[PDB]
Every structure is written in structure tokens, then in C-alpha cells.
């Protein structure tokens, strides 16, 4: 009930989003799916950052999932993938807190050519784990009053983020973030439903 599946920090370059650090909880999935589900959440998180404007907050609905993104004006972006029922208000609180703490710890000179292997920030697995229970959300009331007056862009499908002549299938096919198993898993899941 009400799960968080991934939390990741990106540098938003044009056009490419650079993954800096990611945390996942794929334990509710079958053992054989876990590696693929992780890759697809990284792939999904990367694409949402790239198609989102700087200084904007958005929620992307797909299946029973909700992907919340905050791309800041300084080019740091955070993505949390959750179940739709998880309260969006607290998800953005989560993104606000991690991007703050990350930018305080990790100098922006490391962002444009950074990668998980070269970025030392270990806190991400802790925040995801702690936010599994919304009741233990770190309450900044000052950003809460800020978030209340903050608008969020709703995308009803992943189709909403892409261009008019763009299929999700081609981006999946050509992906460098997705392994061959992931791409297959996507292709069979498209066939079945």
C-alpha cells in the first residue's frame, strides 16, 4: 500500500539528462523483473526530466503509477516514482528536500559530467526508505506554504510529454539506458495488454 519505487537526481543538459544518483525499491516485484523494472524507472525518469522545463513541477500518470518531477532553475532535477495513491503533496516535499541537500553537498561543477560512480551522495536510499511512511515526512512549513501556492503540470500519459510524431516504442528501441532484456520485457508487455 502507497509505495515509493524510485528516487533519482539528474543534471538537466540540453538535450540529455545526466543521471547523478539513484535509489530504488523494487522488492514488491518478482525477482526476475526487478533488474528490468529498475532500468525502466531510470529510463522513464530520464525522459521526464528532458521533456520538462526548468523551474517546473510535473506529475506524469501512466498505469497505477505517478512520476513526480521537479526540474529546478539551476538545472538540478529530482524524480520520484510512486503509486498513484501516494500523496503528491509529500512527494514534492521529498523532492524539495533531496535537491536542497544534494546541491549543498555536491558542487555543480561535478554535475555536467557526473555519474553515480563519480558522485558521492549516499543519502538517497535513506530518504526513499524514510518516505515509505508519509507520516515521517520532514515538515518544512515554509516550503509547504510555498508548495500550496505552487502549480503542478499533469501529464495524463507519457504520450503527453513526447512530440506529435513520437512513439514511446522508438525511444525504448533506441535507448542507451535500457538493456536488451528490458527492451524485450517492454515489447512483451505491449503485446499482452
Ligand X SMILES: CCCCCCCCCCCCOP(=O)([O-])OCC[N+](C)(C)C
Binding site for ligand X (CB under 6 A): 28-29, 33, 37, 40-41, 44, 62, 65, 67, 81
In angstroms, give the least distance from the CB of 158 to ligand X: 7
In angstroms, give the least distance from the CB of 156 to ligand X: 12
Residue with smaller CB distance to ligand X, 84 or 105: 84
Residue with smaller CB distance to ligand X, 41 or 49: 41
Residue with smaller CB distance to ligand X, 32 or 141: 32
Query: What are the residues facing 108 on neighbouring strands?
Result: none
* End-to-end alpha carbon distance in the chain: 24
In angstroms, give the least distance from the CB of 170 to ligand X: 17
In angstroms, give the least distance from the CB of 182 to ligand X: 10
**Cα gap 120→146, rounded to integer Å:** 30
In angstroms, give the least distance from the CB of 3 to ligand X: 7
Residue with smaller CB distance to ligand X, 46 or 75: 46
Residue with smaller CB distance to ligand X, 3 or 130: 3
Extract long-range pairs of 109-117: CB within 8 Å, 24+ residues apart. 111/11, 111/18, 111/20, 111/75, 111/76, 112/11, 112/13, 112/18, 113/18, 114/11, 114/18, 114/20, 115/18, 115/19, 115/20, 116/19, 116/20, 116/21, 116/22
**Cα gap 77→60, rounded to integer Å:** 15
Amino acid at each position: 500500500l502507497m509505495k515509493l519505487y524510485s528516487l533519482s537526481v539528474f543534471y538537466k543538459g540540453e538535450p540529455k539528462a545526466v543521471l547523478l544518483k539513484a535509489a530504488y525499491d523494487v522488492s514488491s516485484f518478482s525477482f526476475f523483473q526487478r533488474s528490468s523494472v529498475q532500468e525502466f524507472m531510470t529510463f522513464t525518469s530520464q525522459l521526464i526530466v528532458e521533456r520538462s522545463a526548468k523551474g517546473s513541477r510535473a506529475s506524469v500518470k501512466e498505469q497505477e503509477y505517478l512520476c513526480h518531477v521537479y526540474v529546478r532553475s539551476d538545472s538540478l532535477a529530482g524524480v520520484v516514482i510512486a503509486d498513484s495513491e501516494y500523496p503528491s503533496r509529500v512527494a514534492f516535499t521529498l523532492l524539495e528536500k533531496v535537491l536542497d541537500e544534494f546541491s549543498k553537498q555536491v558542487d555543480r561543477i561535478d554535475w555536467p559530467v557526473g555519474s553515480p560512480a563519480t558522485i558521492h551522495y549516499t543519502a538517497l536510499d535513506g530518504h526513499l526508505s524514510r518516505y515509505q511512511n508519509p507520516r515521517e515526512a520532514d515538515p518544512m512549513s515554509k516550503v509547504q506554504a510555498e508548495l500550496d501556492e505552487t502549480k503542478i503540470i499533469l501529464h495524463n500519459t507519457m504520450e503527453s510529454l513526447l512530440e506529435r510524431g513520437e512513439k514511446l516504442d522508438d525511444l525504448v528501441s533506441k535507448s542507451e539506458v535500457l538493456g536488451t532484456q528490458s527492451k524485450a520485457f517492454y515489447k512483451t508487455a505491449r503485446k499482452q495488454n
